[PDB]
Coordinates of C-alpha atoms and ligand atoms in Angstrom, one line a residue:
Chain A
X1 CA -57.3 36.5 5.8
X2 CA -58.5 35.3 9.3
X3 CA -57.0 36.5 12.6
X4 CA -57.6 35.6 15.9
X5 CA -57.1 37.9 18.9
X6 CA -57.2 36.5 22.2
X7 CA -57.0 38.6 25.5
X8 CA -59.5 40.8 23.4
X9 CA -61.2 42.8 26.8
X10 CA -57.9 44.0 28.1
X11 CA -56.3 47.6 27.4
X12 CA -54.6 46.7 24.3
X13 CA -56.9 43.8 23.4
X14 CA -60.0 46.0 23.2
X15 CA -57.6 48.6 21.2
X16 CA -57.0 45.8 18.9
X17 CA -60.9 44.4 18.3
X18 CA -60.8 47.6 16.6
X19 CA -57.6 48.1 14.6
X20 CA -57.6 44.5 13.4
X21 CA -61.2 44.8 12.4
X22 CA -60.3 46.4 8.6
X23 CA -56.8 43.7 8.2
X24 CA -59.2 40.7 8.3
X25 CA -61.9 38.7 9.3
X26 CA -61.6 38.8 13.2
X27 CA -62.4 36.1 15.9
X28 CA -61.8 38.1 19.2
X29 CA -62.0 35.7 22.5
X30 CA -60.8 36.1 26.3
X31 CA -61.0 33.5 29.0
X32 CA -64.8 34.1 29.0
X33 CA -65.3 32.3 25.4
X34 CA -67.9 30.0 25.8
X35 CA -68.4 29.0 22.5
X36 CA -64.6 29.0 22.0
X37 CA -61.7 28.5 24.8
X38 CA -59.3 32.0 25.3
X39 CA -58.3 30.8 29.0
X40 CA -54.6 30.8 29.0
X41 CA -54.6 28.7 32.0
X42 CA -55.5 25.5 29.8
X43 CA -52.4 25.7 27.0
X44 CA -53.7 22.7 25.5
X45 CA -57.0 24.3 25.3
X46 CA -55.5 27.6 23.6
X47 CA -53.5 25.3 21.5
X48 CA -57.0 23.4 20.3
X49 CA -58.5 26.7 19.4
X50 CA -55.8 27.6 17.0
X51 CA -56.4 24.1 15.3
X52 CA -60.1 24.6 15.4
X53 CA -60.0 27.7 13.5
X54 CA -56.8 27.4 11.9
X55 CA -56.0 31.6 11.5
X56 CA -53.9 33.2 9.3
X57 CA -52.7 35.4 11.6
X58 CA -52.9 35.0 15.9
X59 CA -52.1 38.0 18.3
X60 CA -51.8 37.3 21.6
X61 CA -53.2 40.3 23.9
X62 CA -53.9 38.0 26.5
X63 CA -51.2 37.5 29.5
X64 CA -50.4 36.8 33.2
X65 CA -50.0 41.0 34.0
X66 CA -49.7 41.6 37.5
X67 CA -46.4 42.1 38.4
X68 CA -46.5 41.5 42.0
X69 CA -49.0 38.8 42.1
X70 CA -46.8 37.1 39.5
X71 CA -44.1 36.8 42.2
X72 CA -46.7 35.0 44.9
X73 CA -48.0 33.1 41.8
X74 CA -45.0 32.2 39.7
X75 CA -46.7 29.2 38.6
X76 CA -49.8 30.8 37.0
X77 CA -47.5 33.6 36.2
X78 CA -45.5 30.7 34.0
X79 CA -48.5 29.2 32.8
X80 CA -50.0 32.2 31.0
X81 CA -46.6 33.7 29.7
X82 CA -44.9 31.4 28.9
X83 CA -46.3 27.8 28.8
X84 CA -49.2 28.6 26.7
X85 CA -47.4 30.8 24.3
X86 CA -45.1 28.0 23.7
X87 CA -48.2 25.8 22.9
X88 CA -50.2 28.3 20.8
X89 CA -46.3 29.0 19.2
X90 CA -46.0 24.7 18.4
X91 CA -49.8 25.3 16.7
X92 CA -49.2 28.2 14.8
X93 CA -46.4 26.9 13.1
X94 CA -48.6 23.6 12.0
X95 CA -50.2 26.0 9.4
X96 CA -47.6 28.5 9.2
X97 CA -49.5 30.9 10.9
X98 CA -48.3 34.1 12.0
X99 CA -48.0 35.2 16.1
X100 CA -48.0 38.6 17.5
X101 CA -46.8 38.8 20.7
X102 CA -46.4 41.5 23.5
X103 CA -43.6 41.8 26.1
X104 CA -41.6 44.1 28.4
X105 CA -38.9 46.0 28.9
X106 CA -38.9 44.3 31.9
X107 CA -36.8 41.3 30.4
X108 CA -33.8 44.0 31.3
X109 CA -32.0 44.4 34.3
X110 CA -31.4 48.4 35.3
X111 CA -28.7 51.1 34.1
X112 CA -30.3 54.8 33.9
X113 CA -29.8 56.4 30.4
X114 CA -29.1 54.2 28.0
X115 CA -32.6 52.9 26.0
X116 CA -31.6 49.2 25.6
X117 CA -31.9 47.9 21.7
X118 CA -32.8 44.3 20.8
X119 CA -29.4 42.7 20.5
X120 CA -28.7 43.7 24.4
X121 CA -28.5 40.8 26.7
X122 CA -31.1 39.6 29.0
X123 CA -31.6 39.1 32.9
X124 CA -35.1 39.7 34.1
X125 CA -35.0 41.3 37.7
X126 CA -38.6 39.5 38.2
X127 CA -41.0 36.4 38.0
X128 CA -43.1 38.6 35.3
X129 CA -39.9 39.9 33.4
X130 CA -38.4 36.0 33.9
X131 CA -41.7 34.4 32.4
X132 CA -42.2 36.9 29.4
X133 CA -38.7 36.2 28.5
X134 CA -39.4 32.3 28.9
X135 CA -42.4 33.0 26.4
X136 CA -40.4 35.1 24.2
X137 CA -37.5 32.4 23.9
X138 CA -40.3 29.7 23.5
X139 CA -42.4 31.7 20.4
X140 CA -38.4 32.1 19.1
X141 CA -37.6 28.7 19.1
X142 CA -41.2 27.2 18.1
X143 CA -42.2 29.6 15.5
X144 CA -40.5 31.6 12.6
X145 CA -43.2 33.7 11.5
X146 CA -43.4 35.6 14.3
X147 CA -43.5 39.4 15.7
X148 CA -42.7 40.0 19.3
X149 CA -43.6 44.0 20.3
X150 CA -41.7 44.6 23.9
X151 CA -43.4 47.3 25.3
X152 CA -43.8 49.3 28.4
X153 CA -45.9 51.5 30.7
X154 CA -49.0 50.7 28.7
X155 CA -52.6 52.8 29.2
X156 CA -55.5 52.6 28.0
X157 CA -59.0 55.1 28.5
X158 CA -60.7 52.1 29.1
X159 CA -60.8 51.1 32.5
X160 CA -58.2 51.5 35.1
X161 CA -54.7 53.2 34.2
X162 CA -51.8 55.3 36.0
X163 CA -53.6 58.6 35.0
X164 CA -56.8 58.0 36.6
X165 CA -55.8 56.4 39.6
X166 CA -53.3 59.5 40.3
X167 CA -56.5 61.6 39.2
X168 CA -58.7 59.9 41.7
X169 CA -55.5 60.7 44.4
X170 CA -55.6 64.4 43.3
X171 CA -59.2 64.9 43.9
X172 CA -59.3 63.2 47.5
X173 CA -55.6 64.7 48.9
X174 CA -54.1 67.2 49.6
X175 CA -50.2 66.2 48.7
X176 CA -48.7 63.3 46.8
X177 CA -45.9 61.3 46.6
X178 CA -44.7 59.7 43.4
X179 CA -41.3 58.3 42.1
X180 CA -39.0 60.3 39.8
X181 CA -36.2 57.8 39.4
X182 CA -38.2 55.0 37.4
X183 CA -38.1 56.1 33.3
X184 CA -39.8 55.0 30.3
X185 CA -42.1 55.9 27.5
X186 CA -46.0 55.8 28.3
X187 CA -47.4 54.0 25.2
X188 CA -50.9 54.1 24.7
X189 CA -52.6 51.0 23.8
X190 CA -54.1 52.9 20.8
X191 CA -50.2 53.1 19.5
X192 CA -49.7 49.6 20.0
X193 CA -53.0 48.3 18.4
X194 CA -52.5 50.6 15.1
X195 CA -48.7 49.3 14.9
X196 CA -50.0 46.0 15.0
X197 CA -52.3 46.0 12.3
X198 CA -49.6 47.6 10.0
X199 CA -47.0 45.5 10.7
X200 CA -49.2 42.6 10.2
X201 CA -49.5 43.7 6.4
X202 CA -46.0 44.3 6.0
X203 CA -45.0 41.5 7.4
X204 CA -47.3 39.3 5.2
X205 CA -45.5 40.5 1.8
X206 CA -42.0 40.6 3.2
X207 CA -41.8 37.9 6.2
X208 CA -37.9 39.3 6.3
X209 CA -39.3 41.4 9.2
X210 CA -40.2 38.6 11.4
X211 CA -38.1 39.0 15.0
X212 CA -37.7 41.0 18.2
X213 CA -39.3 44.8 18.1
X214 CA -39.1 47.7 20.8
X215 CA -42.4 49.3 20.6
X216 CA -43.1 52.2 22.7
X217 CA -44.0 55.9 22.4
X218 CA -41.1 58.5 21.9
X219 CA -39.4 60.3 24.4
X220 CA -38.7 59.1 27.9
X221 CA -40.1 60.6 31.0
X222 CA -41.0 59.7 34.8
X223 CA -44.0 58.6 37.1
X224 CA -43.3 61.9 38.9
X225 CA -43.7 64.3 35.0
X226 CA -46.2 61.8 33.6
X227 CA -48.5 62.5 37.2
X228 CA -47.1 66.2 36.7
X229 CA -48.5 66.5 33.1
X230 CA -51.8 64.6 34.3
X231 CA -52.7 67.2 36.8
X232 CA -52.0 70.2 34.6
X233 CA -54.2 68.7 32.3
X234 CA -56.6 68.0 34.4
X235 CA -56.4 71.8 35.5
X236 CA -56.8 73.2 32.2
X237 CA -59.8 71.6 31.9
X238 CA -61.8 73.1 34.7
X239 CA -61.1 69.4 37.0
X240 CA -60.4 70.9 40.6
X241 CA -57.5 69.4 42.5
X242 CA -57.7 69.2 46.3
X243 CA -53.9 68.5 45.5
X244 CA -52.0 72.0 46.3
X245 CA -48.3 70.5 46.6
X246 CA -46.7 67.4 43.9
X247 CA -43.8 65.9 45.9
X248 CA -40.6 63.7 44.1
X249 CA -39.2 60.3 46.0
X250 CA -37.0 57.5 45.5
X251 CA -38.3 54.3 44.7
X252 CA -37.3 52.2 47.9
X253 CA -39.0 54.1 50.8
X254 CA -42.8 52.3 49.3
X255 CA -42.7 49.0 49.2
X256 CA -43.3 46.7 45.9
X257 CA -42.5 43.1 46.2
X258 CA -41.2 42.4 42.3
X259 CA -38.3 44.5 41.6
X260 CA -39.2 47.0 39.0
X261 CA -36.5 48.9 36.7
X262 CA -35.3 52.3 37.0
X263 CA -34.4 52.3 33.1
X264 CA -37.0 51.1 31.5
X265 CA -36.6 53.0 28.1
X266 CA -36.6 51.6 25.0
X267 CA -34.7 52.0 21.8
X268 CA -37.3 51.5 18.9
X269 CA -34.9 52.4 15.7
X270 CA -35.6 48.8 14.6
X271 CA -39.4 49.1 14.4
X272 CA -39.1 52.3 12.8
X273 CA -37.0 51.3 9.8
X274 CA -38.8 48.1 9.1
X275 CA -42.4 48.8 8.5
X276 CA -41.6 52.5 7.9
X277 CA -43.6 53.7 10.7
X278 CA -43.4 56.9 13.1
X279 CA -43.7 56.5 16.7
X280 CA -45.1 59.7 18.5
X281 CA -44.1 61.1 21.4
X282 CA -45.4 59.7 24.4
X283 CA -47.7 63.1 25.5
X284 CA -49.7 63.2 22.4
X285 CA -51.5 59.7 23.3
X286 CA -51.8 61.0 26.8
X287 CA -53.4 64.0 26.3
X288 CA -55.7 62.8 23.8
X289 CA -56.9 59.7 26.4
X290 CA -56.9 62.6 29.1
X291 CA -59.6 64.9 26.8
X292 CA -61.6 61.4 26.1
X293 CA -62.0 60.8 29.6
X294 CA -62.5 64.9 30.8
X295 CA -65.1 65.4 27.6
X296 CA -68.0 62.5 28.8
X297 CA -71.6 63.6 28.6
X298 CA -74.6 61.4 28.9
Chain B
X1 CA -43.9 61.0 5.2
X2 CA -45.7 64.2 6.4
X3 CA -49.3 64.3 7.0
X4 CA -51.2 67.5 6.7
X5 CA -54.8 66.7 8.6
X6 CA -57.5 69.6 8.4
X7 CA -61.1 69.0 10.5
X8 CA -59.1 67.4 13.5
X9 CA -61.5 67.6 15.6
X10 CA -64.9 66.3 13.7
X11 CA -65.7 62.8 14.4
X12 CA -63.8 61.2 11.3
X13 CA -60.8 63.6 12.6
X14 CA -60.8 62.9 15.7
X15 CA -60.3 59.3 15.1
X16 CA -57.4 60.5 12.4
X17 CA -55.7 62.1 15.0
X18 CA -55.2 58.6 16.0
X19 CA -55.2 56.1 13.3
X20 CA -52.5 58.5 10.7
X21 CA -50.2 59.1 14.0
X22 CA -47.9 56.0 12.9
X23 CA -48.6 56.4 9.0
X24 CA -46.4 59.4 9.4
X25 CA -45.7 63.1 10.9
X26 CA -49.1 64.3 11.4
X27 CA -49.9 68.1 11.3
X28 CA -53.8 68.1 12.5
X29 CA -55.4 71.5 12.0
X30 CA -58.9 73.1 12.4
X31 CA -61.0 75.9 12.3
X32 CA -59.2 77.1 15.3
X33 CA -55.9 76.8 14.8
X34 CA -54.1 79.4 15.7
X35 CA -50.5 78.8 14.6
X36 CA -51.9 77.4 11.0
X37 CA -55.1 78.6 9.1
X38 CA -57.8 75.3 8.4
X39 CA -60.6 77.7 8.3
X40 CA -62.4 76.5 4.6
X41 CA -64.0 80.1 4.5
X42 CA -60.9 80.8 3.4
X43 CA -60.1 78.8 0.0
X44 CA -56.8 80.5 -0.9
X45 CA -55.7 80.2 3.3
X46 CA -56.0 76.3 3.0
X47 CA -54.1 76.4 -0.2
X48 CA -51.5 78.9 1.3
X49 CA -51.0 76.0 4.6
X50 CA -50.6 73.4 1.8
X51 CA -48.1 75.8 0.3
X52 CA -46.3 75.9 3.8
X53 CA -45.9 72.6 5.2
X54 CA -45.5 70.7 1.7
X55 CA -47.2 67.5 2.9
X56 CA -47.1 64.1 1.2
X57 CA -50.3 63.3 2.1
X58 CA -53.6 65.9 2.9
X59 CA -56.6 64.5 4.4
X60 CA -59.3 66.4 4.7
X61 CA -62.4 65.5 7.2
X62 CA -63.2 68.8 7.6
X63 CA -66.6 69.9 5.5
X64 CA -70.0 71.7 6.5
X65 CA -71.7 68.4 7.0
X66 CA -75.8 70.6 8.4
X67 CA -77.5 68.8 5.6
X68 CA -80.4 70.8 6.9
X69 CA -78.5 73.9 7.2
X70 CA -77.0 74.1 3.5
X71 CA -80.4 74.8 1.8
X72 CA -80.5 78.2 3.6
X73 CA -76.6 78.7 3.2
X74 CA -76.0 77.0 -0.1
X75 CA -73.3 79.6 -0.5
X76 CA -71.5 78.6 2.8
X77 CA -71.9 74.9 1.5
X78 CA -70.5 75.8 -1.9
X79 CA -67.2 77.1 0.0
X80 CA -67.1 74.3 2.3
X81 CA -67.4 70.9 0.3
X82 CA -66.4 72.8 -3.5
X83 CA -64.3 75.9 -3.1
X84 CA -61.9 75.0 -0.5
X85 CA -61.5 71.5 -2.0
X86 CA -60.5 72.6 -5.9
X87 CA -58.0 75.1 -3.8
X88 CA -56.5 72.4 -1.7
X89 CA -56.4 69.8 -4.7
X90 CA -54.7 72.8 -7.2
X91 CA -52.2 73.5 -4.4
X92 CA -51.8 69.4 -3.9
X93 CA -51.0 68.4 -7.0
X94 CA -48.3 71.4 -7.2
X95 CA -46.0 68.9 -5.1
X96 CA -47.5 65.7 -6.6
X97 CA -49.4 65.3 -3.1
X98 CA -51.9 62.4 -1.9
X99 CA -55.3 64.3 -0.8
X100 CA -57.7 61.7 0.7
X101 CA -61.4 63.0 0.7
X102 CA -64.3 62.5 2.0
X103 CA -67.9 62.1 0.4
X104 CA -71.4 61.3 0.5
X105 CA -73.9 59.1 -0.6
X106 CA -76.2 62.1 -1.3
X107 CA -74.5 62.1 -4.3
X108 CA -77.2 59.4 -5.3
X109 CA -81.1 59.7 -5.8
X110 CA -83.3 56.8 -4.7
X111 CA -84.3 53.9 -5.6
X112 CA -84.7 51.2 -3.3
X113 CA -83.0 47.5 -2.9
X114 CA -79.7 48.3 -5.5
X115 CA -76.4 49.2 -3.6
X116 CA -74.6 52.1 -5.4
X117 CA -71.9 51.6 -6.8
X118 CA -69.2 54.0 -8.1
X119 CA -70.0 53.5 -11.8
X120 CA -73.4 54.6 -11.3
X121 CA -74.8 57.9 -12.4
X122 CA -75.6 60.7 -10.4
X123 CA -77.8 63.6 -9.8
X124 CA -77.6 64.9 -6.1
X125 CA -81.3 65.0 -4.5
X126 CA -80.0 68.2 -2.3
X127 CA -77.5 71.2 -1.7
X128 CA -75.5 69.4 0.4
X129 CA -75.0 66.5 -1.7
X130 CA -74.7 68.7 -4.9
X131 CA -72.0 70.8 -3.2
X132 CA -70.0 67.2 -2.5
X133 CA -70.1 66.0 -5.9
X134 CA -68.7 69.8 -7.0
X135 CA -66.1 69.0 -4.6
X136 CA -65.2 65.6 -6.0
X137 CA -65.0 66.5 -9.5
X138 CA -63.2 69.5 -8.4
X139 CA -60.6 67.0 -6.6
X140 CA -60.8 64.5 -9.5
X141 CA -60.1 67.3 -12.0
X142 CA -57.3 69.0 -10.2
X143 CA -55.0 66.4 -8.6
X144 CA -54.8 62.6 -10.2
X145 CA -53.8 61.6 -6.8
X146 CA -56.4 60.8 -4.9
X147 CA -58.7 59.2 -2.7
X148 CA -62.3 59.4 -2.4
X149 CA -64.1 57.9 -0.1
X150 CA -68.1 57.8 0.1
X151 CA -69.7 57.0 2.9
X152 CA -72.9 57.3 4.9
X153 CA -74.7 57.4 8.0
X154 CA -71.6 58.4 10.0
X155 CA -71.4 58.2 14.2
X156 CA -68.5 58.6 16.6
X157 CA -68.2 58.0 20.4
X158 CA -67.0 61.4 21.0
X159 CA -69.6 63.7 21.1
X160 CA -73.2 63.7 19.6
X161 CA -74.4 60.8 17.8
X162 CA -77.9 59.0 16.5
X163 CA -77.2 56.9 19.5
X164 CA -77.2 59.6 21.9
X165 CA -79.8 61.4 20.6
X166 CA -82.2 58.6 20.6
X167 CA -81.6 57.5 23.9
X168 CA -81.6 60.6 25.1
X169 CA -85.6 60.5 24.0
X170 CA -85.8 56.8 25.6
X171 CA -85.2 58.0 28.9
X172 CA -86.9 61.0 29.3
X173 CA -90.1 60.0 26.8
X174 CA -92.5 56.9 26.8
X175 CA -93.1 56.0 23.2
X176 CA -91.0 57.1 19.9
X177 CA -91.5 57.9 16.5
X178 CA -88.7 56.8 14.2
X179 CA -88.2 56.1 10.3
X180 CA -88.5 52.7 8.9
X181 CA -87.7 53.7 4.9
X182 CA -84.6 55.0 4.8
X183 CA -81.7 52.3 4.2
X184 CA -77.9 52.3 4.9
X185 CA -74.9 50.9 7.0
X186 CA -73.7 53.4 10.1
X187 CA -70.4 53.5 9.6
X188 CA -68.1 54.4 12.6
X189 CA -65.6 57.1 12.5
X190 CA -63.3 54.3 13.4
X191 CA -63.9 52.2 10.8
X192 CA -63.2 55.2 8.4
X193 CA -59.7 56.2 10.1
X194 CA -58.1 53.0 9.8
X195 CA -59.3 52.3 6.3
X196 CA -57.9 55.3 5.4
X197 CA -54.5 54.5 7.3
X198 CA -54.2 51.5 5.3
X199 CA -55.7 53.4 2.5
X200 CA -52.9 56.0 2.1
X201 CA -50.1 53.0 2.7
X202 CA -51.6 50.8 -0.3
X203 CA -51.3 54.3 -2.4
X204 CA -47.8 55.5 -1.9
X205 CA -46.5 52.3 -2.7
X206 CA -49.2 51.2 -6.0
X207 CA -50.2 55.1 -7.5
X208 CA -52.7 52.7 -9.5
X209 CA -55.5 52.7 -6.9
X210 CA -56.4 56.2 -7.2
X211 CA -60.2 57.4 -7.7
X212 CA -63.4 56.9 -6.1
X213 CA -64.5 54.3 -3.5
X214 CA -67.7 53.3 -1.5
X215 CA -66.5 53.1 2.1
X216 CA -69.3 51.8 4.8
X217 CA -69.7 48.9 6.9
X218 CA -71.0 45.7 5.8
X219 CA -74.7 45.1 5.9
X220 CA -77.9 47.5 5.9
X221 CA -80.4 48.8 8.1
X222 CA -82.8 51.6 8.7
X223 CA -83.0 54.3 11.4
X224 CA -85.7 52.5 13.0
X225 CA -84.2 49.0 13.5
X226 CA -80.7 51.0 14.2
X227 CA -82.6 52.7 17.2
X228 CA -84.4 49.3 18.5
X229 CA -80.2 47.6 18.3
X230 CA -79.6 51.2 20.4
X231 CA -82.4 50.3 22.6
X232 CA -81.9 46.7 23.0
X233 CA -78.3 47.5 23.5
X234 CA -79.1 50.2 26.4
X235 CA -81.5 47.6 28.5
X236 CA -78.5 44.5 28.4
X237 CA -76.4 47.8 30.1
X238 CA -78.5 48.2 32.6
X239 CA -79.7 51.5 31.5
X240 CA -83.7 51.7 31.9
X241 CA -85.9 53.1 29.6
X242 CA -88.7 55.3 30.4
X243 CA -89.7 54.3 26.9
X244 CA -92.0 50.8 26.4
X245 CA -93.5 51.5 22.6
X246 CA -91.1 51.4 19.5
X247 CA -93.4 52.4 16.6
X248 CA -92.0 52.9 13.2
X249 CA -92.7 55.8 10.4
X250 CA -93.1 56.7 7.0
X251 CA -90.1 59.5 6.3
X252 CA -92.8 62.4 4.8
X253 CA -94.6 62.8 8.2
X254 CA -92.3 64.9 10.0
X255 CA -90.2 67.6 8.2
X256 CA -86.8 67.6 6.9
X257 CA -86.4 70.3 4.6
X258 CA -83.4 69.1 2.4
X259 CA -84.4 65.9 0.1
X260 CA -82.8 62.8 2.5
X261 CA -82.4 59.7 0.0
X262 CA -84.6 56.3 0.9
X263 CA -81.6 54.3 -0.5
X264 CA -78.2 55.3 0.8
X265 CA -76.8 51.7 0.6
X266 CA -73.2 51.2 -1.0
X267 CA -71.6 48.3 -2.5
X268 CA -67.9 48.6 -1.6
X269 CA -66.3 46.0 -3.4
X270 CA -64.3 48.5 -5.4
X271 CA -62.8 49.1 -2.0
X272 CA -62.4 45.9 -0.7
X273 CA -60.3 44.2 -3.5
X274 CA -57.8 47.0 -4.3
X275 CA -57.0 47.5 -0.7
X276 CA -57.7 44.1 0.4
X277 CA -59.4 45.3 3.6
X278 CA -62.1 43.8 5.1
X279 CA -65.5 46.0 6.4
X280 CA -67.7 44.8 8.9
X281 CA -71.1 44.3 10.0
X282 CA -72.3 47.5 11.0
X283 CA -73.8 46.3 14.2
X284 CA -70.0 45.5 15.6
X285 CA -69.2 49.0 15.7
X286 CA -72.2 50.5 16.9
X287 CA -72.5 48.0 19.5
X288 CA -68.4 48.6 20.9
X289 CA -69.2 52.8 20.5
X290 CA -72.4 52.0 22.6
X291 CA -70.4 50.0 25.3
X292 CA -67.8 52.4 25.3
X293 CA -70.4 55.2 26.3
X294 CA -72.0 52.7 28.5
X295 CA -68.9 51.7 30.9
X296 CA -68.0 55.2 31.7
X297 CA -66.5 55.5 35.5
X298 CA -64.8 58.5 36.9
Ligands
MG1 MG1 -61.2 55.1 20.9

């Protein structure tokens, strides 16, 4: 089989260059292609790659991801989650391809405790949440064979993620404040690429799984406990924290332009029982990102 | 499904510790474990473990891989790769258990330009080699279901690797001596922890593909032209070299003491068409570990 990966140098993208490597013969491109076009900015282009190369299989790691800027730039923010999906969706189902695609929890409005299943209703408290879900509708309605993974509070080792820039707070200050009223499951790009690659076999001998999948680590936790369990990692392995006192707040009193949820959890029963997968808990892919980045030698 | 993991923390396990996380409930253990014993000095304490958690599936990465080291301790060897392995596949196939193994292409003598394949003959060149093939017809004898895989030339991004150690030398030295004779494909511990994923999936659900595989990326090399990709790889990083001479070597020159085979190439076809996997180019792995190591930021 050929796949083709696009977004392949972000967190989950580069996660997936890997994971995907074994499931078949891989074509990875980002908007840097040159010899092939991964800018999601030109749908049409996107939409001429999948006819140039006609895969078996297309994963989209590639969107608009800034949640804020997405506001200022809900145009660009349209384009890249939803327009394009819509035209790499029409594409796909030429050759009866199949599309991965990732989304968010943020496609849900806010109501602390209950983890929201798949058949809940929709109403996306910002542009990014509003666009996804105008991508998700658009892959529904122009493409059968298709998997959509909503996810949420994705990291990655590579490059930038919530850990290190807390880590990076923690070794220049002295006390911190972080929210404790916004919950989820962290869910390692790691979790997310493996997931993929199995579901992509199941679903090619039983397409009776194509739909609508929460996909996140287990459990549910907070900014406030994920930072907490950061630094006492980072303490048991011998990192020294100028940090001396971790402080709890509200949401509002820090300003962030795009509304973010306070329930962001996620019901993943549905994922579970149909490609017969586990879903860890949400420290174990921490941690072991935490030791990869505290155990580098040169 | 449980998932009983001993060596966790080699390079093959570490990347386990990832790639089974989804296949099932993973139990990784070591030599260290406290709570659990996964010493292999202790034949009838790995059985007893296997004996305590009743897994569906045991994958063992954990073996005394010091080539070198195993002539002086063939005894230790013995234990390690033989022993340990007829005690873990006795206790396995008590429950009707998978055990997934891992081998080596020491297995094989030399002879230049023909791939190995699994219906060849074989007559181990070394201790290290001769303990592994114990240890496979140990497993083979003991247990009907399981998984071998061969490989060769194994490197992981986490910790000490061919890579490191050679450029290591390319900073600090100005011209290097490096074997030109010996032939194989590196094969990345990640390659081997998501073949083995899909591995153990394909066998729970078709018992048929049982036995003995050839598992190693695509295409061959030798040490030599793997250290001048290294190299090459290290100055389009922007790493400078101290060195400015690559000269190749004949493998007798400098001393190894255990027998290391000229031809360690595999042909995995075997592999390939009962799992329907795909194995790269060697080069793609070694050249996204080499990045990895390359773009580290704190
Ligand atoms: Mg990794």
């Amino acid at each position: 089989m050929n796949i083709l990966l696009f977004g392949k140098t972000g967190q989950v993208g580069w996660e997936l260059q890997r994971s995907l490597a074994p499931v078949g013969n891989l074509i990875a491109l980002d908007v840097h292609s040159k010899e092939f076009c991964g800018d999601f900015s030109n749908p049409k282009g996107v939409a001429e790659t999948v006819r140039k190369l006609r895969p078996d299989v297309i994963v989209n790691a590639a969107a608009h991801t800034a949640v804020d800027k997405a506001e200022s730039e809900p145009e660009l923010a349209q384009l890249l989650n939803a327009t394009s999906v819509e035209a790499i969706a029409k594409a796909a189902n030429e050759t009866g391809a199949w599309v991965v695609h990732y989304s968010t929890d943020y496609v849900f409005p806010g109501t602390g405790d209950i983890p929201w299943q798949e058949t809940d209703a929709t109403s996306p408290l910002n542009v990014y949440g509003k666009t996804k879900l105008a991508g998700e509708k658009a892959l529904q309605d122009n493409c059968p064979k298709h998997l959509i993974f909503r996810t949420s509070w994705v990291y990655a080792g590579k490059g930038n993620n919530f850990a290190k820039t807390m880590l990076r707070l923690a070794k220049e200050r002295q006390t911190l404040s972080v929210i404790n009223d916004q919950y989820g499951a962290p869910t390692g790009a790691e979790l997310l690429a493996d997931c993929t690659a199995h579901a992509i076999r199941v679903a090619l001998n039983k397409p009776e799984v194509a739909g609508l999948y929460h996909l996140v680590a287990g459990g549910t936790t907070t900014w406030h406990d994920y930072a907490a369990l950061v630094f006492d990692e980072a303490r048991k392995a011998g990192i020294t924290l100028a940090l001396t006192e971790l402080n709890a707040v509200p949401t509002s009193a820090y300003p962030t332009p795009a509304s973010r949820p306070g329930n962001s959890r996620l019901n993943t029963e549905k994922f579970q029982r149909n490609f017969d997968l586990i879903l860890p808990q949400w420290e174990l892919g921490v941690k072991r990102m935490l030791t990869e980045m505290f155990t580098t030698t040169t």
